[PDB]
């Protein structure tokens, strides 16, 4: 199927306590693979997946220098934005960026993205055309103007279409055993009493990769909507994921309800009941 290279970038000011904290975290699909953190003992880009250990010193030096350069740019940004918004020098503020590209199963670009936020709100983003910006407020319009005069969209477009795609392909190649693998979910159902002759049935799915999964409860070939609780799919500490979905059903009628688990690694979806 399709595949993604994504960078999550965060810069956070801390007036009175030194320079901002700056972090870059990289993912191929749902797997963390590189990280830079300014508060580490020796700040440098580091592998977060064993397959990246194959990249030689020149990769690490080039990425580390890009990261220290980005740290300095975001440091400047934080200061600039205080001015755009007429803010005091004494408060903590956050810039976030998501940056990357998605290619299809044929290796070609499906979409590229570059979205910025300030203090948790949309600021500026590159449009799907890869040519023009969309600005969320009057401050971001200053950035938009700066970036148009500089030809920033054309430089960003060259990265999204060339560099980003080409490095995604390389990463998929170098880590294919890990990245192209499929780990199947293992499922079970648990039972919990409630007041007034009601019970919670909770359906668990464990040990799966990729993260994308769907869990549903049925009654008579009918997917339940009401009384449903769930958690967002979540990492389990070893590069696999887990999830659960529960429903409140009347005491003694547990045997009517079925949990259904759908995943890329299953030849057929799983159906299961309380036991």
């Amino acid at each position: 199927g399709p595949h993604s290279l994504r960078y999550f970038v965060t810069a956070v000011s801390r007036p009175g306590l030194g320079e901002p904290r700056y972090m870059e975290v990289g993912y191929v699909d749902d797997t963390e693979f590189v990280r830079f953190d300014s508060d580490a003992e020796n700040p440098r880009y580091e592998p977060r997946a064993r397959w990246m250990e194959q990249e030689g010193p020149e990769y690490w030096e080039r990425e580390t220098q890009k990261a220290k350069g980005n740290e300095q740019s975001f440091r400047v940004d934080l200061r600039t934005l205080l001015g755009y918004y007429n803010q005091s020098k004494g408060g903590s503020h956050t810039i976030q960026v998501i940056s990357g590209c998605e290619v299809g199963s044929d290796g070609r670009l499906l979409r590229g993205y570059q979205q910025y936020a300030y203090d948790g709100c949309d600021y500026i983003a590159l449009n799907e055309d890869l040519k023009t910006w969309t600005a969320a407020d009057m401050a971001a319009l200053i950035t938009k103007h700066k970036w148009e005069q500089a030809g920033e969209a054309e430089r960003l477009r060259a990265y999204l279409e060339g560099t980003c795609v080409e490095w995604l392909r390389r990463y998929l190649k170098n880590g294919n055993a890990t990245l192209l693998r499929t780990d199947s979910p293992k499922a079970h159902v648990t039972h919990h009493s409630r007041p007034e002759d009601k019970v919670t049935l909770r359906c668990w799915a464990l040990g799966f990769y990729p993260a994308d999964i769907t869990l549903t409860w049925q009654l008579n070939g009918e997917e339940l909507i009401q009384d449903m609780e769930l958690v967002e799919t979540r990492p389990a500490g070893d590069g696999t994921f887990q999830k659960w979905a529960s429903v409140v059903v009347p005491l003694g009628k547990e045997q009517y309800y079925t949990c259904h688990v759908y995943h890329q690694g299953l030849p057929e979806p799983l159906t299961l009941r309380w036991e």
Binding site: Y7, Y116, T143
Partner: peptide, 8 residues
């Protein structure tokens, strides 16, 4: 590989 970001 990460982008080299512009100032805002």
């Amino acid at each position: 590989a990460v982008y080299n970001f512009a100032t805002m």
